[PDB]
Assembly symmetry: D2
Homo-oligomer: 326 residues x 4
Amino acid sequence: LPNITILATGGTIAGGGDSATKSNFTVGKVGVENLVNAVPQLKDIANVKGEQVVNIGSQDMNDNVWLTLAKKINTDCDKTDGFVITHGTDTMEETAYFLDLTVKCDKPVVMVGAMRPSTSMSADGPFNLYNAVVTAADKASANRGVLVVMNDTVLDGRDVTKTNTTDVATFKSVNYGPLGYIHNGKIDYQRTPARKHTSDTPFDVSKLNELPKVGIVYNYANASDLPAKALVDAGYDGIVSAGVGNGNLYKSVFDTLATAAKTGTAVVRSSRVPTGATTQDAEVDDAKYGFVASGTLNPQKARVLLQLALTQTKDPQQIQQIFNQY
Amino acid sequence: LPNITILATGGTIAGGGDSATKSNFTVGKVGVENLVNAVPQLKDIANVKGEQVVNIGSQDMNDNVWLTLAKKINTDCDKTDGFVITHGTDTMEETAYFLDLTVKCDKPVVMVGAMRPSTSMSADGPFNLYNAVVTAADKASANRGVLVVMNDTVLDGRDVTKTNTTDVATFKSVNYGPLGYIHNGKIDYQRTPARKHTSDTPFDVSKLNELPKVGIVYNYANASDLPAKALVDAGYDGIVSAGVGNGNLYKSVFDTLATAAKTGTAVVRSSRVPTGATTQDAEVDDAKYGFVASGTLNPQKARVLLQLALTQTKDPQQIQQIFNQY
Amino acid sequence: LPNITILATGGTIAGGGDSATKSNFTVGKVGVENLVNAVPQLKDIANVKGEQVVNIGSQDMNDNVWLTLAKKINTDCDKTDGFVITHGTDTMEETAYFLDLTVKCDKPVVMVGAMRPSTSMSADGPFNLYNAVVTAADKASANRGVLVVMNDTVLDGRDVTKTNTTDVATFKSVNYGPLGYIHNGKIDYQRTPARKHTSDTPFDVSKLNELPKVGIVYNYANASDLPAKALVDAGYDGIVSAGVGNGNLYKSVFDTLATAAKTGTAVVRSSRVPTGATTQDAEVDDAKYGFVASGTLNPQKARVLLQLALTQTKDPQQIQQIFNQY
Amino acid sequence: LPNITILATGGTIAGGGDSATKSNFTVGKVGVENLVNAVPQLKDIANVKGEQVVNIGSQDMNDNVWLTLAKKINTDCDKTDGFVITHGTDTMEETAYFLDLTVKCDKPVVMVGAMRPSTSMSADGPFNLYNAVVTAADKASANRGVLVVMNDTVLDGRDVTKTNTTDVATFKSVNYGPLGYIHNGKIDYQRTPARKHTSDTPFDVSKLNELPKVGIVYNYANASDLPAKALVDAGYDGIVSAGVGNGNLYKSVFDTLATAAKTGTAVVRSSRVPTGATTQDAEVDDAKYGFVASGTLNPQKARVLLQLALTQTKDPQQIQQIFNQY
Ligand SMILES: N[C@@H](CC(=O)O)C(=O)O
Ligand SMILES: N[C@@H](CC(=O)O)C(=O)O
Ligand SMILES: N[C@@H](CC(=O)O)C(=O)O
Ligand SMILES: N[C@@H](CC(=O)O)C(=O)O
């Protein structure tokens, strides 16, 4: 059987409350094999090895945990057959993409969480975990970049996003679709991401101990520019604008970002719209202002790419070429 | 024939570029009957009357235009049979909800825009406009609150949102669905919003010349609290948190908002997740901190309701009862 | 506590296999009590009464079980506070609509199934059943027609349909959306079906012992007319055509049905297309041929309505008025 | 400029009515040139060559047109740079997949239709055609199998399907998603179909003049077996069952097909359910009965594959291996 290493980071997947009727869910609530003893069926498809990296609610996820997982994975690659990462569902789409860009291991790396606390009836965690490990042990899962396995579906780290606040079927690659579907331990792959990932990226955080400073400003009617200004005065390396429609910005916010763009601040235009790309040929002329169009990357994902892009350049033209290849 | 008044506000619906191959679209590009002469078929279903209120790109939409439309509509109610409002698509979901809460006229009020410039081939504006006026002239459209008509569909002002950056089929009530579908001028209504609207709301901006100050902060991994702090120090009346998952906040942002909540700042928790409600029984205990759960209202909509709620109260418990009824 | 009556008819909701890894699922596998003892939390929200009407796999569902459930519910109405009906998921959409047209009880009537056998991990049956009982005990569920509760959602029997073959979140009302969402025992209703149902229908099967004969023919490229012909020669009261696109038919099938239309056979045009209405103003001129357009009803629901319409008429013009009101 | 060959077969893309208010749409209404002169911008992106293969409404599409298009494309391959095929939207999904299996040309082969007659306002034909030609002229479109371009989207012929009866954004690849999105003449490809197609299939209709006989029976509550029986007695090579749920059949239909399976009739199990795969490990045991599971292929696509599979075998075990690779 394959040697599957499980890197735990916390999340609902490893926590409940007190009863099925009601529960006091917070961030976590249990160690590692607890999340191995509960699903005794795993022992049938793999040799699982656990290790608690940290144990928080993804809502508090941050650069350090990211950098750690990245290094941890790069280091253990040769010693194991595939990795499974338990994680909260709130920022799972953010961590998955980061790892997708930094992991240099091409053996399966599957992320998995749970939308219901283990204490609830019909909790999805146990089946999600099973399937995740099944995917990880599957030879065919290799070379597809970081994956996310939820509700019998295999989703790529780039397009995946949480589309619903409570639904167990929340996760979907809203622009390009899933890569495969799972049935009784069997996976039918019919897709694989085109953009370069993992071992094929220039990014390598092996020696980094911290990442650039990137913030996200939001756009709406009568929007205030203070948040934008705040991040500027506070000296931030880059800023992702969650624009309205196709990457548009409210006057105020536009000016502030237009100026900061001069000062030498990396500005990427993304959109609050859940689906579709922020194209370069629209209302705004990024060429003149130095803005970068995020494409199909949403605000929180465009950030991930801006940080890494900044670890290697500050030229809007370069950063933009990056946003067109990863 | 019914007397349909058209209140123009600009938007792509009234603008193009230069050619079909390429165009220099900005915010607007044409007056009022231009948007009446182009679709000569209107004269067959109604007596259209135009009036340019303003002419901007919804990306710059703001409180004043809102307050104006509100007053304009309340005033003209008795003189016309229904209203049609041309508007940009970028913040259409924001203006529609505001009017839904303030218009005291129960005669049809339909909003409509266009995802393609009139200069492009297969431009959707002309058909959207037609259908909008058809809906407005339809007796059955009355008493359903403010509507939005795009791609042969009739959507309510509350649930409607832009789900795609370029698709002509972008607008969808993502939580509860459309109210009716249009076919050859005929509408099949099978739904009507349950929450109280228009004439049944306590809100009345007749005498207001400005609205409270509400800003939106965004949540992601390693989120910064500066934007939140900025809006606080700048003395804002309320703040809507675009949280992760079910209304959760990143540590930093949570503290800042938790404190400001004491100071007397109205804090509502919404989510960046495009679908689903931000419930009151989750991780965070709003009772202790004074936060209000937005429900199915997204960030930019929860703002609209916070502003109006503030024009009448600052008690979290009251504001919350409002978020459960409108 | 409410007195909720549970009428069981079988389905996966009441059956598994042998183990979590593998199971030998067929049609059923357990009585009534079992589906009450498994969820001991029910006792806290209601006074449940069981009764096994039948116990098959919905794939074998038929007119008799329908007539029975209808009669059973009508008779029991005054004795209980609400009904829950465990059912298979394959034809649940068909049964749900039938009851929606024939039940003359306006107290809560909720249908519920499960996509995963009770033997699997993360089975969805126990939570569905819970929620279905919460729904049936809720005063606000009355007068909304027959409901279907699956995956924390309350769907009407007319629009609901199975959109996926294996997904637990398979049931959706694809044209008009859900009526409400369930959350920690609480239901947020924001919709209600406009079409007349239950107590407001002319249909009453009290004295019927059998229903008319309606068959469904399918349309594709190079389609054969033999199935259509067979149902004709076999003397069928009506025929629903699962056409391509907007109710279109392949030449062959068209002639056969066009002819049988004269003979006195009730012909309804529906579509194989999952979403949208089959309209009257399209390619085909139903007026000349005597065809009836199904509207948003899919083939299997267009049948339910044709059968009941036939128990009261055979005039295309009247049958069509029926398809426009129910 | 690329030499793009346009093979026309009719459909709405080439027909209207009389006016914008009303039209008498039937099947077609115009030659080839017209669908080139209407869009004078084509001349700037390609050297278009036309040819009218046939001119019907896809509802009447059939094996002959298929065999012809296949042969026509194979023969012309070396003479041109890419093909565009104007087609009706009703059975476009069926034709698209057939070509996907039989075309041995790997240069761009794009299909395209229109949901609105050229006479209506905002007709979608002209922009679809434009984009289809852009797609066919794009070097990156090669080797992706037969494509379908609608509403600014590039869909593969295997997964594509008509999800709505009237919506211009009706075509979607419901299981695996689009391959790319078109934007201002530019295409962002991020996917490509994994299943073998065109030049990598064993199927070659070069010498065939007709295809096997496959029919589709439908499943619902109280279903009749007569249509199944009819296709049997009529001596049909194969039968696709549009089952309920995960390929399940109603008792009656089951026996009939179970028996015909022995007789030597190719029986494939598909589902009426719009999304998801019909799996082999479910209720029914295909191994014992000789049935073949369709996978994600819907009924009308399961037919296309069964016909071609039959041109090379009749062994259930082999036919099944075919459904698992194409
Ligand atoms: N608060 C939890 C939510 C979940 O995982 O379901 C988390 O983000 O880890
Ligand atoms: N920039 C335009 C976009 C559109 O209407 O299509 C607006 O928001 O008005
Ligand atoms: N074949 C079973 C499966 C299920 O219940 O989900 C039925 O339809 O009853
Ligand atoms: N009935 C026509 C309609 C269309 O083309 O869209 C066809 O399928 O060809």
